Amino acid sequence: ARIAGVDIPRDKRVVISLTYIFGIGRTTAQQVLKEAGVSEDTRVRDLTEEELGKIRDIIDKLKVEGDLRREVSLNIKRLIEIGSYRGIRHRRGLPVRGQNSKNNARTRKGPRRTV
Amino acid sequence: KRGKRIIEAKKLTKMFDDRILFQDSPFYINHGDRIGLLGENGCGKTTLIKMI
Amino acid sequence: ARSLKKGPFVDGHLMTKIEKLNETDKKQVVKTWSRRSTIFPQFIGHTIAVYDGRKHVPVFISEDMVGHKLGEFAPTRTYKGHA
Amino acid sequence: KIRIRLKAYDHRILDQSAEKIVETAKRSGASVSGPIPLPTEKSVYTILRAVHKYKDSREQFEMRTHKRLIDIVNPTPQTVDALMRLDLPSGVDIEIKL
Amino acid sequence: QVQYYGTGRRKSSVARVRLVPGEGRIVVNNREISEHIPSAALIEDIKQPLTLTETAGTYDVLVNVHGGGLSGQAGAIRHGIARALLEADPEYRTTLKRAGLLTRDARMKERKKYGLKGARRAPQFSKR
Amino acid sequence: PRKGPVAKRDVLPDPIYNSKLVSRLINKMMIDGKKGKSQTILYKSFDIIKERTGNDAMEVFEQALKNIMPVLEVKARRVGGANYQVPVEVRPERRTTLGLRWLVNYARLRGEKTMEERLANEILDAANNTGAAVKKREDTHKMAEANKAFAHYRW
Amino acid sequence: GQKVNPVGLRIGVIRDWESKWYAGKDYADFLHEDLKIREYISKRLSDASVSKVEIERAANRVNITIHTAKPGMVIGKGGSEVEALRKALNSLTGKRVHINILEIKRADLDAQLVADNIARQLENRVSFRRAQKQQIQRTMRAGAQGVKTMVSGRLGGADIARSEYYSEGTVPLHTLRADIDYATSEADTTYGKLGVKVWIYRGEV
Amino acid sequence: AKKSMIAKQQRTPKFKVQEYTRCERCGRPHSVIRKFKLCRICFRELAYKGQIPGVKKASW
RNA sequence: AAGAACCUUACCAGGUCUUGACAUCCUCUGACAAUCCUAGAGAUAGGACGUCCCGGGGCAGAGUGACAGGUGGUGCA
RNA sequence: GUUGGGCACUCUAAGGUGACUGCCGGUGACAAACCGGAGGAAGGUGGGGAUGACGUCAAAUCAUCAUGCCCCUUAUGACCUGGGCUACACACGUGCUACAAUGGACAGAACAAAGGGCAGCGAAACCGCGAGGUUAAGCCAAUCCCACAAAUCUGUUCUCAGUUCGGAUCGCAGUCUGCAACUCGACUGCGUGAAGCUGGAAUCGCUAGUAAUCGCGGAUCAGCAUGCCGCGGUGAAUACGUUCC
Ligand SMILES: Nc1ncnc2c1ncn2[C@@H]1O[C@H](COP(=O)(O)OP(=O)(O)OP(=O)(O)O)[C@@H](O)[C@H]1O
Ligand SMILES: [Mg+2]
Ligand SMILES: [Zn+2]
Incomplete structure (x- = not known):
C-alpha cells in the first residue's frame, strides 16, 4: 500500500492509514477521502486500484514527505541566517516560544546531565 | 519497557490427524512472566512453542 | 499575532526617520528604542541601532527580515554558559 | 399597580x-401585595489574615443584601403621597416604580 | 381525583410525589422513569417503599422532581413516596420507619475549607 | 481507634440477584466513584459465567469465594530484634472483605483484554480454585501454619 | 496573632455598624467620604473626648452623630464650634451635613475614651502601672462587670519591650453575647510607640 | 507606598491601559478590592471596627 | 503576589531635574492652565491661543528658607 | 407555566416549634456518669463553620500602615524610554496532563449547585472549519444574560500498538485585548507527534456524602491560572485493636 512513497498500514481504516504520510493529519485525511469520495471505514487492504488511484492524485497536490521536510528545514535555516532571536534559540537548544527554562524544557534540552 | 499482554490463547486446540494433543486450552502470558512448561515427553510442549 | 485588520505596527517616529532617509537616498545609522517596531520593506538596506536595554546595537536590515520586530534581532540578555 | x-x-x-x-x-385603602421575601444575596470575601506570608491563614466576611417586594394594587391618589411621605431610616434602599 | 401527596428530599433534589390509584406506573416529569432514571439499582431502590408495603400495582406515582443528580433525584423520589404512603395509611408507619424510609438522609456536600483542597483533603505535607 | 469499635456500613442487595455480596463486589470494582461501570462489568461477567459453565452464575460465584476466603491470617509483631508474624483468626466479615479484594485485584492482573472477561475467568479459576487469588489464600495459610509457634503472642 | 478583635467578632450579632447607610453603585464613593469624615472629626476633636462617630446618608444628606463625653467643648458657645464643623464638612463632602452631638453619661465605660485617656497618661510619663491600675478602679466603680487593660512597648524606656496587663472582674471574650467594648490607642514617647488595649465588659444581652 | 507612587497613580498616565488601582487609604498596589477600593489589610482593619456597611464576619 | 508585555516596579543602562513628583507655611501677583504646531525615545523644551471662580471664601501661579522627600538601615529598639 | 386563573405544592425569608439523657430498662454509690430501648427529621457536644487561655519560638513583617534611633539630601530623593523581575550545565517543594480498553473517537438522551453582570452582562439572527466577527433583543436583575454543566446512560467504531494512547516541542497561518504580544500574553486552524508501558531509596492525604473522580462559578483582571477561594454531580474501602513508631 505505497502512497507518496509511504507504505501506509494495510490493515487500518483508510482515515488512519493516510495519517502515516508526513504532512497529513486526521482532518486532512477526512478531506482527501471526502474529496475522493472513498469510505472512511474500509480497510486499506480492501481498497480497489481505482480508489487508491484517486487518493494518490489528490495527495500530490499537498506538500508531504520530502517536500514538507525541505520547506520546514528552510524555515529553520532562514531564522538562523538572519540572526534572529528565534534562530539563536533553535541552534542553542532552548525554548523558542518564551517558555521558562529554569525548570522543565527537557524536550529541547534532552536528558538531565546532573552536576 | 513494553506492554502487559504478550500471549493469549482462547479455545486453543491442536490435533495431528486424529490425535488431539490438547483441546479447548485457554491460557495467557504477560510481560515478565517466567513460565515453566511441565508435562511428560510427547505431551506437546515443543508443539505449543512452534505455534507461538 | 497583531490582527490583520489593524495592519502591521511600526512606531511612526521611526517610520518618519526612514522616510526622510529614503527621500534623499541616504543611509545613516538611525538610533531607536522601538524594539517593538515591525521591519517593513522600506527599511531594507538601512542600519538601525536598536536599544537592547543598555546600548544601541547596529542591526543591518536584509530583505529576509521584513515582518519581524526590530527587537527580535537585538537580544537583551547576556549568557555565555555555566561552568 | x-x-x-x-x-x-x-x-x-x-x-x-x-x-x-x-x-x-392600606390605610389609604389601596390593596397591598404582602411583602414578598426575595432571595437574599450573599457576597463573600476571603482575605489573607496576616500582613505578610502565611497564605493558609484566611478570614472570610460576607455581605447579605436582604430584599422585599411590595406591590400595591388598586392605588389611590392619596396613597401615592403617603408612599413618598414616609421617611424610612437610613440604610434601607427604597425603589418605587409605577 | 383521590390522590396522596408527599415531599421527598435527597441532597440537592426535591421530589413532589403524588400517589394516585393506578397500576404501578412511575411518571417523573412526564416521562417513564426508565427514560429519566437509567440505573436499574436506582429504580429498585425507588420502588422499595412500595415493595415493603406490598402496594406495587396499587398506585401510580406522579413525581415532579428538580435539582441534584440522577442518584439524588432517585433518593428524593423514594423519600417522597414513603411520606405519601403515610397519608394513605397510618398503619404503614411502623414498617417504613423500621426500614428507615422515613428518615431524611441529611448527608450534604461539606463546604470546602480554606487551606484545604476539599472538605478534608489537606495539601501534601513535607518536612524538608 | 482507641475509643472502641465503630459502626460498619450496610449495603443494599443487588437489584438483579438480590445479594449483598454481589453489591459489595461492585463497590470493590468501582473506580473514581463510577458505580455504573462496575455494575455493567459484573453483570457482563455473570453472563459469561452462566454462558460458559451453564450453571447459575451466583452459585459459581459463591463457590469461588468459599475457595478464596481465608480462615487464618498473620499479623506482624516486633519482638525485640526479630519481627514475628503472629497467626490470627480472620473475623467472618474480614473473610468476605479479603475474598472480594483479592479476587478483584488479581482479576485486574489477568491477561484478557476486557475486565468482564478477566473477572469471569478469575471467578471460574477460583471455582476450580486454581487461579492467582486462590494462590494468595494458600500463601497466608502457609505463613500462619509455619509461624504457628508464635500464636501465643497477641496484643 | 491569636485573639480576634472583640468588636469584629460581634458585629451584626449583638453590635451594630456605626455607618448605617446602604448604597449600590455609589458604595465605593460613599465609603471613602466617611473615612475622610471620621479622620477629620478625630483630629478636630482630638481633645473633645470623641468616642464614636455614626454616619447616615439620605439622598444628598449626611447625618453625622458624634458621641462625646464633653458635649460642651464640641458645641461651643451658642453652637459656634458645631456650626464651624458643619461648614468644614460641607466643604469636604460637598453635601448638606447635619451634626448631632450625643452626651456619653458614663465617660469611663467607653473603651475608646479609656484607651485614649490612658495613652495621654503614658505620654505624660506617668507610671504605666499606676495609669492602668488607677483607670481600672475608676471603670469598675462605674459598674462594669469586668475590665482588662494592656500597655505594650518600651515600658519606661527599656531596651527590651514587654507587655503588662491588668484585669478586674470577668471579661468573657469567648462569649459571643457578651457586650464587650474594645479599643486601642497609641502613645508617642521619646522611645517610640506604646500600645494601649482596653476591654470593658458591661454585661450580657 | 512612596508618596511619589501615589501621585503618579492618581495622575492620568500616558495610556488608559497604564491606569492601575491602589488602596486609596494606604496606597498598597496589591490585593485591592474593587467594591471597596481597599487593600486586604485596610479592609480587615475597618471591617473589625464596623465601618464597612453590611460587612460582617462570615461562617457557614 | 486576589493577575511582572508598558503600568505595576521598588532593580539595571541611558537621557534628565533640584522648596523639588508629594505637604503646611510665608510672601508677590494675578489664572493656572487645557489645546494644538515644531523638536525629542520620552521626560522635556520652544512657540501659539486664550488670561482668574465667589476684603479674600478662594483658586492659581511665580520667588523665598523653614522644609519636603526615602519600598534607605535596624523586626535583636 | 405559554394566557386566563390560582399559591394549593415546591421555593424564597422573617417570626415560631424541635434535642433536653427530657422518658423506659439495666449498670453505677444512692453520685456524676455509662450501656441499651421507644418516639422522632434528627440521640447522646446530629454535621460543618466562627470562636484560638497563660505563654513558647529575641518566630514573621521597619516593603500595607505607623514609629525610636542611625544614615542620604544637585542624591540613597524626583522624571523618562528601553531592559530585568520570565536568564539556565543543574538540585528541591507544590501541582497539571498522562502512560490507556473501567479506554480513545463519533453520535443521541439527559440531570446541578453556587456565584457574577452598567460601560457591564450581552440573547437571537447572519458570517467563519475554529478562535471570533456584524447587528442587536433583554437586564441595574428570583424577570434578561453569563449559561451548552461534565462525568453518567445509550448506541457505533477502534482491538492491545508507543497505537485512533499521550500530548511536549516545533513550522505555518490566524483571532482577541491593548499605544504596543521581539525579549514576554491567552486562544484557534493546519502540520509536526517528544518523553511516558504505573515509577528506587523513601514519603503524603483521608474515618462519609469523606477520599477518589467530574465539571461550574468567583476574587484579582483591558488581556492572561494547571494557582487560590467557593459550588454541586457520581461516590467508595476500612477502623479487629493499642504490641510497635
Ligand atoms: N507432525 C506430526 N505428526 C504426528 N505426530 C506428531 C507430529 N509432530 C509431533 N508429533 C508427536 O506429537 C507430540 C508432540 O511432540 P513435541 O516435540 O511437539 O512435544 P513434547 O513431547 O512436549 O516435547 P519435548 O521434545 O520437549 O519432550 C509427540 O508425541 C510427537 O511424537
Ligand atoms: Mg520437544
Ligand atoms: Zn490599604
Missing part, C-alpha cells in the same frame, strides 16, 4: 421599614 423594592443589610430594619410601607398604603 405600584411596585416597591426594599433592600437592606439588616433584615430587622427592613421588616420594620416594610411594615410602615404596607400600613400606610
Whole structure:
C-alpha cells in the first residue's frame, strides 16, 4: 500500500492509514477521502486500484514527505541566517516560544546531565 | 519497557490427524512472566512453542 | 499575532526617520528604542541601532527580515554558559 | 399597580421599614401585595489574615443584601403621597416604580 | 381525583410525589422513569417503599422532581413516596420507619475549607 | 481507634440477584466513584459465567469465594530484634472483605483484554480454585501454619 | 496573632455598624467620604473626648452623630464650634451635613475614651502601672462587670519591650453575647510607640 | 507606598491601559478590592471596627 | 503576589531635574492652565491661543528658607 | 407555566416549634456518669463553620500602615524610554496532563449547585472549519444574560500498538485585548507527534456524602491560572485493636 512513497498500514481504516504520510493529519485525511469520495471505514487492504488511484492524485497536490521536510528545514535555516532571536534559540537548544527554562524544557534540552 | 499482554490463547486446540494433543486450552502470558512448561515427553510442549 | 485588520505596527517616529532617509537616498545609522517596531520593506538596506536595554546595537536590515520586530534581532540578555 | 423594592443589610430594619410601607398604603385603602421575601444575596470575601506570608491563614466576611417586594394594587391618589411621605431610616434602599 | 401527596428530599433534589390509584406506573416529569432514571439499582431502590408495603400495582406515582443528580433525584423520589404512603395509611408507619424510609438522609456536600483542597483533603505535607 | 469499635456500613442487595455480596463486589470494582461501570462489568461477567459453565452464575460465584476466603491470617509483631508474624483468626466479615479484594485485584492482573472477561475467568479459576487469588489464600495459610509457634503472642 | 478583635467578632450579632447607610453603585464613593469624615472629626476633636462617630446618608444628606463625653467643648458657645464643623464638612463632602452631638453619661465605660485617656497618661510619663491600675478602679466603680487593660512597648524606656496587663472582674471574650467594648490607642514617647488595649465588659444581652 | 507612587497613580498616565488601582487609604498596589477600593489589610482593619456597611464576619 | 508585555516596579543602562513628583507655611501677583504646531525615545523644551471662580471664601501661579522627600538601615529598639 | 386563573405544592425569608439523657430498662454509690430501648427529621457536644487561655519560638513583617534611633539630601530623593523581575550545565517543594480498553473517537438522551453582570452582562439572527466577527433583543436583575454543566446512560467504531494512547516541542497561518504580544500574553486552524508501558531509596492525604473522580462559578483582571477561594454531580474501602513508631 505505497502512497507518496509511504507504505501506509494495510490493515487500518483508510482515515488512519493516510495519517502515516508526513504532512497529513486526521482532518486532512477526512478531506482527501471526502474529496475522493472513498469510505472512511474500509480497510486499506480492501481498497480497489481505482480508489487508491484517486487518493494518490489528490495527495500530490499537498506538500508531504520530502517536500514538507525541505520547506520546514528552510524555515529553520532562514531564522538562523538572519540572526534572529528565534534562530539563536533553535541552534542553542532552548525554548523558542518564551517558555521558562529554569525548570522543565527537557524536550529541547534532552536528558538531565546532573552536576 | 513494553506492554502487559504478550500471549493469549482462547479455545486453543491442536490435533495431528486424529490425535488431539490438547483441546479447548485457554491460557495467557504477560510481560515478565517466567513460565515453566511441565508435562511428560510427547505431551506437546515443543508443539505449543512452534505455534507461538 | 497583531490582527490583520489593524495592519502591521511600526512606531511612526521611526517610520518618519526612514522616510526622510529614503527621500534623499541616504543611509545613516538611525538610533531607536522601538524594539517593538515591525521591519517593513522600506527599511531594507538601512542600519538601525536598536536599544537592547543598555546600548544601541547596529542591526543591518536584509530583505529576509521584513515582518519581524526590530527587537527580535537585538537580544537583551547576556549568557555565555555555566561552568 | 405600584411596585416597591426594599433592600437592606439588616433584615430587622427592613421588616420594620416594610411594615410602615404596607400600613400606610392600606390605610389609604389601596390593596397591598404582602411583602414578598426575595432571595437574599450573599457576597463573600476571603482575605489573607496576616500582613505578610502565611497564605493558609484566611478570614472570610460576607455581605447579605436582604430584599422585599411590595406591590400595591388598586392605588389611590392619596396613597401615592403617603408612599413618598414616609421617611424610612437610613440604610434601607427604597425603589418605587409605577 | 383521590390522590396522596408527599415531599421527598435527597441532597440537592426535591421530589413532589403524588400517589394516585393506578397500576404501578412511575411518571417523573412526564416521562417513564426508565427514560429519566437509567440505573436499574436506582429504580429498585425507588420502588422499595412500595415493595415493603406490598402496594406495587396499587398506585401510580406522579413525581415532579428538580435539582441534584440522577442518584439524588432517585433518593428524593423514594423519600417522597414513603411520606405519601403515610397519608394513605397510618398503619404503614411502623414498617417504613423500621426500614428507615422515613428518615431524611441529611448527608450534604461539606463546604470546602480554606487551606484545604476539599472538605478534608489537606495539601501534601513535607518536612524538608 | 482507641475509643472502641465503630459502626460498619450496610449495603443494599443487588437489584438483579438480590445479594449483598454481589453489591459489595461492585463497590470493590468501582473506580473514581463510577458505580455504573462496575455494575455493567459484573453483570457482563455473570453472563459469561452462566454462558460458559451453564450453571447459575451466583452459585459459581459463591463457590469461588468459599475457595478464596481465608480462615487464618498473620499479623506482624516486633519482638525485640526479630519481627514475628503472629497467626490470627480472620473475623467472618474480614473473610468476605479479603475474598472480594483479592479476587478483584488479581482479576485486574489477568491477561484478557476486557475486565468482564478477566473477572469471569478469575471467578471460574477460583471455582476450580486454581487461579492467582486462590494462590494468595494458600500463601497466608502457609505463613500462619509455619509461624504457628508464635500464636501465643497477641496484643 | 491569636485573639480576634472583640468588636469584629460581634458585629451584626449583638453590635451594630456605626455607618448605617446602604448604597449600590455609589458604595465605593460613599465609603471613602466617611473615612475622610471620621479622620477629620478625630483630629478636630482630638481633645473633645470623641468616642464614636455614626454616619447616615439620605439622598444628598449626611447625618453625622458624634458621641462625646464633653458635649460642651464640641458645641461651643451658642453652637459656634458645631456650626464651624458643619461648614468644614460641607466643604469636604460637598453635601448638606447635619451634626448631632450625643452626651456619653458614663465617660469611663467607653473603651475608646479609656484607651485614649490612658495613652495621654503614658505620654505624660506617668507610671504605666499606676495609669492602668488607677483607670481600672475608676471603670469598675462605674459598674462594669469586668475590665482588662494592656500597655505594650518600651515600658519606661527599656531596651527590651514587654507587655503588662491588668484585669478586674470577668471579661468573657469567648462569649459571643457578651457586650464587650474594645479599643486601642497609641502613645508617642521619646522611645517610640506604646500600645494601649482596653476591654470593658458591661454585661450580657 | 512612596508618596511619589501615589501621585503618579492618581495622575492620568500616558495610556488608559497604564491606569492601575491602589488602596486609596494606604496606597498598597496589591490585593485591592474593587467594591471597596481597599487593600486586604485596610479592609480587615475597618471591617473589625464596623465601618464597612453590611460587612460582617462570615461562617457557614 | 486576589493577575511582572508598558503600568505595576521598588532593580539595571541611558537621557534628565533640584522648596523639588508629594505637604503646611510665608510672601508677590494675578489664572493656572487645557489645546494644538515644531523638536525629542520620552521626560522635556520652544512657540501659539486664550488670561482668574465667589476684603479674600478662594483658586492659581511665580520667588523665598523653614522644609519636603526615602519600598534607605535596624523586626535583636 | 405559554394566557386566563390560582399559591394549593415546591421555593424564597422573617417570626415560631424541635434535642433536653427530657422518658423506659439495666449498670453505677444512692453520685456524676455509662450501656441499651421507644418516639422522632434528627440521640447522646446530629454535621460543618466562627470562636484560638497563660505563654513558647529575641518566630514573621521597619516593603500595607505607623514609629525610636542611625544614615542620604544637585542624591540613597524626583522624571523618562528601553531592559530585568520570565536568564539556565543543574538540585528541591507544590501541582497539571498522562502512560490507556473501567479506554480513545463519533453520535443521541439527559440531570446541578453556587456565584457574577452598567460601560457591564450581552440573547437571537447572519458570517467563519475554529478562535471570533456584524447587528442587536433583554437586564441595574428570583424577570434578561453569563449559561451548552461534565462525568453518567445509550448506541457505533477502534482491538492491545508507543497505537485512533499521550500530548511536549516545533513550522505555518490566524483571532482577541491593548499605544504596543521581539525579549514576554491567552486562544484557534493546519502540520509536526517528544518523553511516558504505573515509577528506587523513601514519603503524603483521608474515618462519609469523606477520599477518589467530574465539571461550574468567583476574587484579582483591558488581556492572561494547571494557582487560590467557593459550588454541586457520581461516590467508595476500612477502623479487629493499642504490641510497635
Ligand atoms: N507432525 C506430526 N505428526 C504426528 N505426530 C506428531 C507430529 N509432530 C509431533 N508429533 C508427536 O506429537 C507430540 C508432540 O511432540 P513435541 O516435540 O511437539 O512435544 P513434547 O513431547 O512436549 O516435547 P519435548 O521434545 O520437549 O519432550 C509427540 O508425541 C510427537 O511424537
Ligand atoms: Mg520437544
Ligand atoms: Zn490599604
